[PDB]
Design an enzyme around this catalytic site. Structure first.
Site, short mmCIF file in Angstrom:
data_model
loop_
_atom_site.label_atom_id
_atom_site.label_comp_id
_atom_site.label_asym_id
_atom_site.label_seq_id
_atom_site.Cartn_x
_atom_site.Cartn_y
_atom_site.Cartn_z
N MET A 1 -5.02 -8.75 1.51
CA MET A 1 -3.80 -9.22 0.89
C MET A 1 -3.93 -9.21 -0.63
SD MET A 1 -3.75 -13.33 1.35
CE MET A 1 -3.67 -13.44 3.14
N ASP B 267 -1.09 10.43 -3.80
CA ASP B 267 -0.22 9.54 -3.01
C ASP B 267 0.82 8.91 -3.91
OD1 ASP B 267 0.74 8.50 -0.56
OD2 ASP B 267 -0.60 6.74 -0.58
N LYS C 220 -6.35 -8.20 -5.62
CA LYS C 220 -6.41 -7.49 -4.35
C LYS C 220 -7.74 -7.78 -3.63
CE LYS C 220 -7.06 -2.94 -4.84
NZ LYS C 220 -6.64 -1.47 -4.93
N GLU D 158 0.76 -7.24 0.58
CA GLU D 158 -0.40 -6.76 1.33
C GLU D 158 -0.96 -5.44 0.79
OE1 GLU D 158 -2.08 -7.91 4.43
OE2 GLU D 158 -1.14 -9.86 3.97
N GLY D 159 -2.29 -5.41 0.57
CA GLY D 159 -3.01 -4.19 0.24
C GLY D 159 -3.44 -3.43 1.49
N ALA D 160 -4.31 -2.42 1.29
CA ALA D 160 -4.76 -1.61 2.42
C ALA D 160 -5.87 -2.28 3.23
CB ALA D 160 -5.28 -0.26 1.95
N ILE E 220 1.47 -12.49 -2.79
CA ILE E 220 2.47 -11.60 -3.34
C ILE E 220 2.64 -10.29 -2.57
CG2 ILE E 220 2.27 -12.57 -5.69
CD1 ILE E 220 0.72 -10.28 -6.61
C1 LIG Z 1 -0.39 -1.43 -6.46
C2 LIG Z 1 0.45 -0.91 -5.30
C3 LIG Z 1 1.62 -1.80 -4.97
O1 LIG Z 1 2.15 -2.50 -5.81
C4 LIG Z 1 2.20 -1.83 -3.56
O2 LIG Z 1 1.35 -1.18 -2.64
C5 LIG Z 1 2.53 -3.28 -3.15
O3 LIG Z 1 3.37 -3.30 -1.98
C6 LIG Z 1 1.26 -4.09 -2.86
C7 LIG Z 1 1.47 -5.58 -2.79
C8 LIG Z 1 2.13 -6.17 -4.03
C9 LIG Z 1 1.34 -5.83 -5.26
C10 LIG Z 1 1.81 -6.48 -6.55
C11 LIG Z 1 2.89 -7.38 -6.54
C12 LIG Z 1 3.33 -8.00 -7.70
O4 LIG Z 1 4.40 -8.87 -7.67
C13 LIG Z 1 2.72 -7.72 -8.90
C14 LIG Z 1 1.64 -6.85 -8.94
O5 LIG Z 1 1.08 -6.65 -10.15
C15 LIG Z 1 1.16 -6.21 -7.79
C16 LIG Z 1 0.01 -5.29 -8.01
O6 LIG Z 1 -0.59 -5.29 -9.05
O7 LIG Z 1 -0.31 -4.44 -7.02
C17 LIG Z 1 -1.57 -3.69 -7.10
C18 LIG Z 1 -2.73 -4.61 -6.78
C19 LIG Z 1 -1.42 -2.52 -6.10
#
Ligand SMILES: *[C@H]1CC(=O)[C@@H](O)[C@@H](O)CCCCc2cc(O)cc(O)c2C(=O)O[C@@H](C)C1
Length: 342
Positions: free
Chosen positions: A28, A139, A44, A23-25, A21
């Protein structure tokens, strides 16, 4: 172990049916079915242990999120890692699966004024809790604001957070930095380490502007350009605001610039609610000591349909006030994550 896009994504057997879904820091992010709770979740992957600074960001976030509990902050549901420090190479953090984030939403969707108001309310309600714990997010930006299918909003990522330290906030010109560029307050480039709560309020003001028009208000092309964009809209700082900047390099830089007029908010945002623009102006104030605080923002007339201080909770246990080597930090991450082991 199950693999995703060539990489190990080792979360089972509780979490199955994985989908990439984003990319994290430090890895993925995937969605996954949680066979215990019978819902899909976000996971994450973090691989920090080779670098003291990665370990720092990871530990900071885990420690903050395991103490925080708030409807507008995404929590940690589960943490997955090997049973021993020796075998631990990655850490997985499990969180609620949301629908989208505000960065993605603003790329294609016009917000109604009702959506803008409700999003801003929820951002400030979560931020009230964060600041009441003596913590700065540092941030805030659209991609860190997650939304579910009914537009409930949760703040993501505390990897850059710090305990507030206003008495040690001063620094030299062109030193710092704090936040993602477009969301950085002007004082970061002048005389501030980003250790006061006003840094977060500036970022929220940038987010509000971006909800009004679907474009970043101050899209500086590089570090140095960011202050050009800010001053091109706010205009030249007053004498009083300059006098508040005692650092000579910073003050003489501003004094060296030609005069710039303020651009009226209703000219930049001609379809915006006038109460929204009045609040925007108070969040995007140049002098951080004159900038509105989170509790004043919640009480602003723009948010009157939602404001209710008894339903805007604060932290029970604020954070009171650390850089040391990665081996101790790995040990600290192992210990902080122990509660989730079977
Ligand atoms: C929160 C931060 C965040 O959402 C952004 O940095 C994103 O680009 C990171 C990748 C997708 C994260 C995501 C995607 C979907 O569809 C649903 C989610 O619940 C999350 C999510 O919880 O992101 C968290 C882990 C980081």
């Amino acid at each position: 172990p199950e693999m995703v896009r060539g990489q190990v994504f080792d979360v089972g057997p509780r979490y199955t049916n994985l989908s990439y879904i984003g990319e994290g820091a430090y890895g993925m992010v995937c969605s996954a079915y949680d066979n215990l709770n019978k819902v899909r979740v976000a996971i994450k992957k973090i691989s920090p242990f080779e670098h003291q600074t990665y370990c720092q960001r990871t530990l900071r976030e885990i420690k903050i999120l395991l103490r925080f509990r708030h409807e507008n902050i995404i929590g940690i549901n589960d943490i997955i890692r090997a049973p021993t420090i020796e075998q631990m190479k990655d850490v997985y953090i499990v969180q609620d699966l949301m629908e989208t984030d505000l960065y993605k939403l603003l790329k294609t969707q016009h917000l109604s004024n009702d959506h803008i108001c409700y999003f801003l309310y929820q951002i400030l309600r979560g931020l009230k809790y964060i600041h009441s714990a003596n913590v700065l997010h540092r941030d805030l930006k659209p991609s860190n604001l997650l939304l579910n299918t009914t537009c409930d909003l949760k703040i993501c990522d505390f990897g850059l957070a710090r305990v507030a330290d206003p008495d040690h906030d001063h620094t030299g010109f062109l030193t710092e930095y704090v936040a993602t560029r477009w969301y950085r307050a002007p004082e970061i480039m002048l005389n501030s380490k980003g250790y006061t709560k006003s840094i977060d309020i500036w970022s929220v003001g940038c987010i509000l502007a971006e909800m009004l028009s679907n474009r970043p208000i101050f899209p500086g092309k590089h570090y140095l350009d960011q202050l050009n964009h800010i001053l091109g809209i706010l205009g030249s700082p007053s004498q009083e605001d300059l006098n508040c900047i005692i650092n000579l390099k910073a003050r003489n830089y501003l004094l060296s610039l030609p005069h710039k007029n303020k651009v009226p908010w209703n000219r930049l945002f001609p379809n915006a609610d006038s109460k929204a623009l009045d609040l925007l102006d108070k969040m995007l104030t140049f002098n951080p000591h004159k900038r509105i605080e989170v509790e004043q923002a919640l009480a602003h007339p723009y948010l009157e349909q939602y404001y209710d201080p008894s339903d805007e909770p604060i932290a029970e246990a604020p954070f009171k006030f650390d850089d040391l080597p990665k081996e101790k930090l790995k040990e600290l991450i192992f210990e902080e994550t122990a509660r989730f082991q079977p």
